[PDB]
Structure 1
């Protein structure tokens, strides 16, 4: 009960900032996650024994892939932590509990391949889940781990609070399917501009939580340039492997995944910042003004890619 997690001074201060990098020491990430749960939720939200067992089972079910790995899970949870801490009063106790767990669990058992590749491969998961294939798998894995003996971190919730939190986590994880982001943000854009956005409307909160999940999921584009640039290598290592696997199915991959077109990466990043990231953090900043630092950091990284193209690096 009286057992706080404490971090070294530098981490204690920087963990509160959106651009925090969780570092190369894997063994500190569980403690960093528990620290965030304690400050974001309370020291009572979860039985520490059960939370610790949950965290270590989640870690075990992330794979050793260059990007969609345990570090990504904790990184995406930290962004959600920073959003929740900068928007104290806007979110329920249930939402703060569910969303940190949703972020930790959102890419469970990722293999480093897109929904498109699963469908073209004719992977069994693509027969079981026609849309948001990996994301329905991720929620399935989350429920599976929650049901391991000693792993139900929600057992102290009432029956209806339990159903509500699993529904928050399900929508949160499904929302990380980028195919759904485009229409979700368009709808949120319309609602904010015509002034119909209403956070007491459950269907509207769902949409806002969805955008928060896209924003946390993409948060590697909101780090200091050296972090963003090195993470970009990790995600391209997965894209190129998928492109290799497309060529093995006798399909020319999209240029994003073709390692023969590495020269086109800088312009491909511009498209991605302009088509996805900048729009995502702009709408998020309009709805949740204290998330502006994510938009500023994202614009800084776009500018750095423009500099790469102009040969200045």
Structure 2
């Protein structure tokens, strides 16, 4: 009865396999795109189509109308994870394929457009509930809520212990998108790869590798073609500046990336970000998963485009 196979137009069918695919401006195509990626990376029998569709639409409803941390970010992040899985298909378990696409879709659920810092300084109730990874623990709690709605248990064919494992994959993957945790996790993986101690059969080493994959997916907008990366940078900065305004309303001077008066210093901020965060991220990931090379290559090309802006040629 699974004779209803999802298909895409010719251009999308070919380009969705490229790391630098952009999912386009047609919101009503994104659910079909996510199902197609699930059917091909996981299998057409991983999920009941009616529960997956109900789940997908409840998740979309619980993302907010914000410039960057929105439904389009959720699907873009999931597509990057699709491209890593299809190009390293021998390395992951059945449960990891199931959990990771869902983790990426759900990873910024109910994002208001504010950092963990603003929530601490504002004394938001979520900061009292979750002392560290504040928004990330909230995103995970929102995932569990949606899964627990009538007709939304997309994992209903799994045993109790398998359900419990995949929810633990999703919880750790979502927490790993807290960039404050990425610095420590990348350092550990760097030393582990360089001393030849890294071991993909060690569950605590899998946890770290999947963490880094989540960081790489979450930043994958710096790995698109220049026009996409430049336009998407306006979207995140719109959020940065709005948080900066809110820091000023609390009588607190915002850090520089969040001050809308420091607009002319965006090219230098981007330079700072690519060298301190992005390049190291895709470098370490290319070492562990060599087929993820095109992410690093496109990150280097965009770093070069920011250097051309700072010299006044772009």
* TM-score bracket for this pair, using the shorter chain length: over 0.9
1:159 is displaced (CA, Å) by 1.1
1:158 is displaced (CA, Å) by 1.1
Q: Partner residue of 1:143?
A: 144
CA distance in 1, matches of 2:4, 2:162: 26
1:183 is displaced (CA, Å) by 0.2
Instruction: Compute the RMSD of aligned alpha carbons.
Output: 0.3
Q: Partner residue of 2:173?
A: 172
Query: Secondary structure of the residue that 1:88 maps to in structure 2?
Result: coil
CA distance in 1, matches of 2:171, 2:4: 31
Residue correspondence of structure 1 range 278-289 to structure 2 within 5 A: 278-289=279-290
CA distance in 2, matches of 1:275, 1:53: 40
Residue correspondence of structure 1 range 234-273 to structure 2 within 5 A: 234-273=235-274
2:46 equivalent to 1:45: yes
Q: Partner residue of 2:80?
A: 79
CA distance in 2, matches of 1:158, 1:87: 27
Please give the TM-score of this superposition, normalised by the length of structure 1: 1.00
Query: Secondary structure of the residue that 1:43 maps to in structure 2?
Result: coil
Q: String of CA shifts for 1:245-284, please: whole Å, max 9, x gaps.
A: 0000001101100000001110000010000000000000
Q: String of CA shifts for 1:275-308, please: whole Å, max 9, x gaps.
A: 0000000000000000000000000000000000
Q: Partner residue of 1:181?
A: 182
1:171 is displaced (CA, Å) by 0.2
Q: String of CA shifts for 1:55-112, please: whole Å, max 9, x gaps.
A: 0000000000000000000000000000000001000010000000000000000000
1:2 is displaced (CA, Å) by 1.4
CA distance in 2, matches of 1:93, 1:299: 33
CA distance in 1, matches of 2:4, 2:154: 17
Query: Secondary structure of the residue that 1:259 maps to in structure 2?
Result: coil
Q: Partner residue of 1:200?
A: 201
CA distance in 1, matches of 2:33, 2:243: 32
Query: Secondary structure of the residue that 1:90 maps to in structure 2?
Result: coil
Q: String of CA shifts for 1:141-184, please: whole Å, max 9, x gaps.
A: 00000000000000101111100000000000000000000000
Query: Secondary structure of the residue that 2:103 maps to in structure 1?
Result: helix
CA distance in 2, matches of 1:276, 1:72: 19
1:18 is displaced (CA, Å) by 0.3
2:108 equivalent to 1:107: yes
Q: String of CA shifts for 1:40-64, please: whole Å, max 9, x gaps.
A: 0000000000000000000000000
CA distance in 2, matches of 1:153, 1:3: 18
Q: String of CA shifts for 1:10-63, please: whole Å, max 9, x gaps.
A: 000000010000000000000000000000000000000000000000000000
1:309 is displaced (CA, Å) by 0.2
Q: Partner residue of 2:126?
A: 125
Query: Secondary structure of the residue that 1:149 maps to in structure 2?
Result: coil
Please give the TM-score of this superposition, normalised by the length of structure 2: 0.99
Structure 1 gaps of 5+ residues are none
CA distance in 2, matches of 1:100, 1:154: 13
CA distance in 1, matches of 2:94, 2:218: 22
CA distance in 2, matches of 1:257, 1:282: 27
CA distance in 1, matches of 2:191, 2:32: 40
CA distance in 2, matches of 1:244, 1:31: 38
Structure 2 gaps of 5+ residues are none
CA distance in 2, matches of 1:247, 1:178: 23
1:191 is displaced (CA, Å) by 0.2
